């Protein structure tokens with residue numbers, strides 16, 4: 481995955497969303513980079529650097545951690561996505577950036593990143609449509625199930641929005657997120673999502689490599705079965 485000179489294709493984007501691991505240093509009691517390496521070895525198809533909130537690294541320490549995580553992604557041949565921080569994404573030559581409804585406007589961000597991957601968090605039909613109009617390459621819908629990893633989350637919605645989006649004929653790449661585990665991931669794919677994203681199911685697993693591998697196997701099976 482090098483410098484993109486064209487917008488990513490929907491087919492490729494949907495493949496990358498399969499097992500989308502997200503993590504920051506405050507999401508695990510183990511060594512942060514080691515956990516990311518294990519998740520990638522297991523089979524994660526995309527990784528998002530999300531370092532924020534209390535206890536999170538800041539300044540130069542945060543940047544150095546990001547560089548190491550990006551290097552791990554490079555070795556595994558997996559794209560590196562940065563959450564929120566557009567400047568950091570540009571400075572590190574990340575493969576993409578993910579933003580939410582309270583972050584920089586998608587139109588503004590798309591103009592600043594060229595053909596880099598752009599993901600947008602959406603919770604309603606209107607936000608999903610606005611994201612596509614603004615130039616997003618994929619949307620993250622949720623929370624599907626209860627989660628406490630992110631404190632300020634909107635109402636749990638199950639797979640209702642995913643189904644509604646597909647029912648309206650919208651084929652934009654979708655990844656479900658929020659309290660997803662290996663036991664409840666299938667329904668998300670069956671509803672029409674192109675993948676599942678998770679933090680704690682992998683970051684806090686006693687065996688992150690095995691957990692990522694299970695996700696990879698499971699998701700492939702259900703994408704073929706639906």
Ligand SMILES: Cc1c(CCOP(=O)([O-])[O-])sc[n+]1Cc1cnc(C(F)(F)F)nc1N
Pocket residue numbers: 500502528530563578599600601619620621622623626627628629630633655656657658659660677678679680681
């Ligand atoms: C970070 C986050 C949640 C936490 C999930 O933690 P878990 O332990 O797996 O419940 S629930 C909603 N978000 C925002 C968010 C949504 N979707 C994505 C995507 F689209 F890139 F995936 N990235 C994000 N950063």
Ligand SMILES: [Mg+2]
Pocket residue numbers: 563564578579580583
């Ligand atoms: Mg955000």
